[PDB]
Scaffold this active site. Structure first.
Site, PDB file in Angstrom:
ATOM      1  N   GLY A   1       0.786  -1.217   0.000  1.00  0.00           N
ATOM      2  CA  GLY A   1       0.000   0.000   0.000  1.00  0.00           C
ATOM      3  C   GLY A   1       0.821   1.271   0.000  1.00  0.00           C
ATOM      4  N   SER A  33       5.746  -5.217  -2.012  1.00  0.00           N
ATOM      5  CA  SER A  33       6.830  -4.259  -1.800  1.00  0.00           C
ATOM      6  C   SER A  33       6.930  -3.771  -0.359  1.00  0.00           C
ATOM      7  CB  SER A  33       6.652  -3.066  -2.742  1.00  0.00           C
ATOM      8  OG  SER A  33       7.329  -1.924  -2.247  1.00  0.00           O
ATOM      9  N   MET A  34       5.843  -3.203   0.164  1.00  0.00           N
ATOM     10  CA  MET A  34       5.876  -2.707   1.532  1.00  0.00           C
ATOM     11  C   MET A  34       5.680  -3.830   2.539  1.00  0.00           C
ATOM     12  SD  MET A  34       6.265  -0.695   3.942  1.00  0.00           S
ATOM     13  CE  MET A  34       6.958   0.462   2.761  1.00  0.00           C
ATOM     14  N   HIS A  54       9.206  -4.343  -5.790  1.00  0.00           N
ATOM     15  CA  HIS A  54       9.314  -3.470  -6.950  1.00  0.00           C
ATOM     16  C   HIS A  54       9.693  -2.079  -6.453  1.00  0.00           C
ATOM     17  CE1 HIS A  54       5.096  -3.132  -5.664  1.00  0.00           C
ATOM     18  NE2 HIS A  54       5.074  -1.942  -6.236  1.00  0.00           N
TER      19      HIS A  54
END
Ligand code: AGS
EC number: 3.4.21.92
Lengths: 181, 192
Positions: free
Chosen positions: B67, B96-97, B121
């Protein structure tokens, strides 16, 4: 000096109670065995004669109080009737455990040797049952705290009784031979 | 709907929700997209557990598609600030997070399930306006990308140049490859 038999005492109760066969057998055998135990008083070959109390259970208006009262008429030793709903845990404002023994002596005219051979009855025992469901900080007094006090009374031990209505003179009275219903 | 359970304690019975029951055992749940509201809730839980016990390990379950970046960085600094070791587990997926908070856990107490999957990413963004404003927001998002790669290398142990090449595009890493990559330490196949 022939003592009554279980059949004789049962017929006596039949004239005052109806529709209760199993309960009559318990009181007849218990009261019959009671006279034998006190009469011998650890003098015969049987040493350390035990005790066996009674626990009556039934719905309301079934005749529990009737058996306790009608039995006292034919009974030679004294009889009393109290309630545990007013009892407290040795110090609160309501009552004390020794009040039961006080009412017992009134029927025996303050005869310790004759009162120990008497019979006692308790009513409304369900009110003593645990109230808090595995209690908390409140320290229930009307409930659990009363049961623990009775423990020694039912087994047998000395106690303290006011002589003429006090709350500096106390008379010792054993209770190992006293029966409780 | 959330089911209610009963905990047996010495004082008495207590009715707790399924999420509150696990929170009492130093367990936090990270579900759905990472936003400002859900992230601010996890910080309060970590701080609350720190005061209750500063020497017991915390369990952090991560199952999220990622997010907002700024919402996630607030949790990262909190995990490193507090003394207790925040154990991390990967369930289902780690974007990613979500992956950044996974590898940010205490060294030696990071695990990934046998069928989990990790994805990494570069930061996403965009802006519409004058050219002068685009340059400002472009320089800012570039710094974040550089900052996210520096920290990723610190916990994974890889070099900064390797993380940069692998994060230019989406890169999926299965559970065994994550161990070889330094992202996690082991896999909790069975209970022992
Ligand atoms: N089996 C019975 N035979 C004749 N009369 C009965 C019988 N059972 C109850 N009674 C009548 O009901 C009255 C009250 O009986 P109780 O013994 O007080 O009933 P109970 O079950 O003891 O209720 P409790 O003790 O207050 S819970 C007696 O005085 C009788 O008049």
């Amino acid at each position: 000096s022939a003592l009554p038999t279980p059949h004789e005492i049962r017929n006596h109760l039949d004239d005052y109670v109806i529709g209760q066969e199993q309960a009559k057998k318990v009181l007849a055998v218990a009261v019959y065995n009671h006279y034998k135990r006190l009469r011998n008083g650890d003098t015969s070959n049987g040493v350390e004669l035990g005790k066996s109390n009674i626990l009556l259970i039934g719905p309301t208006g079934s005749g529990k109080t009737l058996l306790a009262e009608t039995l006292a008429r034919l009974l030679d030793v004294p009889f009393t009737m109290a309630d545990a709903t007013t009892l407290t845990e040795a110090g609160y404002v309501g009552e004390d455990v020794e009040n039961i023994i006080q009412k017992l002596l009134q029927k025996s005219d303050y005869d310790v040797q004759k009162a120990q051979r008497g019979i006692v009855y308790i009513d409304q025992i369900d009110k003593i049952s645990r109230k808090s469901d595995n209690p908390s900080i409140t320290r229930d007094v009307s409930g659990e705290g009363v049961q623990q006090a009775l423990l020694k009374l039912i087994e047998g031990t000395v106690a303290a009784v006011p002589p003429q209505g006090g709350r500096q003179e106390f008379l010792q009275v054993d209770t190992s031979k006293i029966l409780f219903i | 709907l959330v089911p209610m359970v009963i905990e047996q304690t010495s004082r008495g019975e207590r009715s707790f929700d399924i999420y509150s029951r696990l929170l009492k055992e130093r367990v936090i749940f990270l579900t759905g997209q990472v936003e400002d509201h859900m992230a601010n809730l996890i910080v309060a839980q970590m701080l609350f557990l720190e005061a209750e016990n500063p020497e017991k390990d915390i369990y952090l379950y991560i199952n999220s598609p990622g997010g907002v970046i700024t919402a996630g960085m607030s949790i990262y600094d909190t995990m490193q600030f507090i003394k207790p070791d925040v154990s991390t587990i990967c369930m289902g997926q780690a974007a990613s997070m979500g992956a950044f908070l996974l590898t940010a856990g205490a060294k030696g107490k990071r695990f990934c399930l046998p069928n989990s999957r990790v994805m990494i990413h570069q930061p996403l963004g965009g802006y519409q306006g004058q050219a002068t404003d685009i340059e400002i927001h472009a320089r800012e998002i570039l710094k974040v990308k550089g900052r996210m790669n520096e920290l990723m290398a610190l916990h994974t142990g890889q070099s900064l140049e390797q993380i940069e090449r692998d994060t230019e595009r989406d890169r999926f890493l299965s559970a065994p490859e994550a161990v070889e990559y330094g992202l996690v330490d082991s896999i909790l196949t069975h209970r022992n």
